[PDB]
Amino acid sequence: STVSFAGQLHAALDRISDRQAAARVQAEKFTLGEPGIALNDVMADMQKASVSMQMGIQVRNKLVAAYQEVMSMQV
């Protein structure tokens, strides 16, 4: 097919969302008392999801700045 900016961006945002969801489910099960999951697993995955969130936010800010700079030049 083609690079599919819309489809690619959608897939990336889905990756962010499902990493957050996996971290949240793990923390849910840990605080509910379900055996297995270790504490360091919970903290490490939560921080990984937070870093993914921050990377997405920074990408968004840069792209929004680019779009608003391009759509302001007088033609």
């Binding site: 819309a6 945002l13 889905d14 962010i16 969302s17 949240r24 997405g56 968004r60």
Partner: protein
């Protein structure tokens, strides 16, 4: 679905794309071009665009898209509220009325060009065309329509200009500046027939037909 992450990214970014992409996606292009062209006739601006013309076009496009916004509301804002429809069928259900609205105004050979230069293969039906091809085709078609409407609006004021200049020069007025004479005649034509209501109604009718 998305998880307190991306939701409120895609929303705030969509609000960022609002003024340019979403406003020139629907209307307010034809209306604004026609209003500016009407301002070229009748002489000078005399209508403060930063203050009045843009807001008038904004109100007119709100009126124009009342049906599509109503159908969007019915298809999404009822179901998507709290139950059974979550941002995947909501997206296509809410895309359908706007997409039908745009496809109903697009010249049937704009889409041809933009498919033939996007290297898109066969497009099975009218619904098969993607927004990627639908956006520039709709913009080009709307520019054509705006220029047609502006030309028709220019017709009578051009007629008044030429008839007034002809009267002045035939009655012997060798070298009078017929423009200053014609401008109040332009106003008289435009107000006696109640011109603004005719214009907004004709635009509104022709916009969906």
């Amino acid at each position: 679905s998305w998880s307190l992450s991306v939701q409120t990214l895609v929303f705030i970014t969509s609000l960022t794309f609002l003024p340019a992409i979403l406003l020139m996606m629907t209307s307010f292009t034809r209306i604004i071009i026609v209003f500016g062209l009407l301002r070229n006739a009748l002489g000078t601006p005399s209508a403060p665009p930063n203050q009045v013309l843009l807001g008038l076009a904004l109100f007119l496009t709100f009126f124009i898209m009342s049906p599509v916004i109503d159908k969007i509301y019915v298809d999404a804002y009822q179901p998507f509220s709290e139950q059974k429809i979550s941002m995947q069928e909501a997206l296509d259900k809410g895309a359908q009325p706007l997409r039908a609205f745009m496809l109903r105004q697009t010249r049937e050979a704009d889409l041809a060009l933009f498919a033939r230069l996007a290297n898109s293969g066969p497009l099975q039906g009218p619904e098969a065309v993607p927004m990627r091809i639908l956006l520039p085709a709709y913009v080009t078609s709307e520019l054509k329509t705006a220029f047609q409407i502006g030309f028709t609006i220019f017709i009578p004021f051009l007629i008044i200009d030429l008839v007034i200049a002809s009267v002045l020069m035939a009655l012997g007025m060798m070298m009078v500046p017929p423009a200053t004479i014609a401008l109040p005649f332009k106003l008289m034509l435009f107000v006696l027939v109640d011109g603004w209501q005719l214009l907004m109604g004709s635009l509104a009718q022709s916009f969906y037909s």
